[PDB]
Amino acid sequence: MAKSYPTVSAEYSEAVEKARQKLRALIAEKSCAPLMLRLAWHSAGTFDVSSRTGGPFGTMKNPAELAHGANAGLDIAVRLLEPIKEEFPILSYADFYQLAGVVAVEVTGGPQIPFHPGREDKPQPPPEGRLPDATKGSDHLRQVFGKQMGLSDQDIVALSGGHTLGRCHKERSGFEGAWTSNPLVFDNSYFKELLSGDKEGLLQLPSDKALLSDPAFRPLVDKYAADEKAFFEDYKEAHLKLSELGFADA
């Protein structure tokens, strides 16, 4: 009951569905689901409840936000999706990029995340610096996900499982390597690899490792490594909340 979703026209809803189908095809065909999940997450994860600035309001289309260090390479994702966007002028960029994130999780075998349309495209990007720093630890994760975004510790650990997809690139973040051996499959392998420690051919960031040493995060890592169904359930809830930060709040 924390949300009151807006009424959109039948034509808006039809555009959502037709765009969803185009996104499902393109994301699968171009093998770019991890990049598209990162696009949606960096779009949403800048929300700060104290000022109600940032969040999933389409500002990743703005070159000034694409230029943030944390968003290196997301210009590729914006450009890859623009041909579809041009077919759906009614949709906000805000909705479109969150829909791409939901689709990215779906097409890689993850949970079906509910999608509610109606986000506005806001004119001002957030200030740079809201997103989590991969070199920092649990206090920082709680500042970013908790104090800024309003999400729970469970949400932090579940959402960190987004790293079950994809990899780091030396020219984007400067880190390099995949967390999992199957980076196009949405599964609980991220947590299994965290528990088994560092190993040749796979990467762990300091922020991933902070989940292992924190007394509240660690039980959640253990749970998701053992129980993919529980991971999917908690991930679905956390991604839904993330994708709607600042949007439709009652």
Ligand code: HEM
């Ligand atoms: C918990 C704090 C987090 C930190 C410090 C962090 C940091 C990073 C870094 C440094 C990269 C490498 C980017 C590159 O070089 O291409 C990355 C990639 C990625 N992140 Fe995160 N991330 C966090 C949370 C999340 C969340 C919440 C999600 C989504 C639910 C997510 C999804 C991804 C994905 C899918 C990739 C791979 C992108 C690709 O393959 O192109 N991350 N993250």
Ligand code: NA
């Ligand atoms: Na995986």
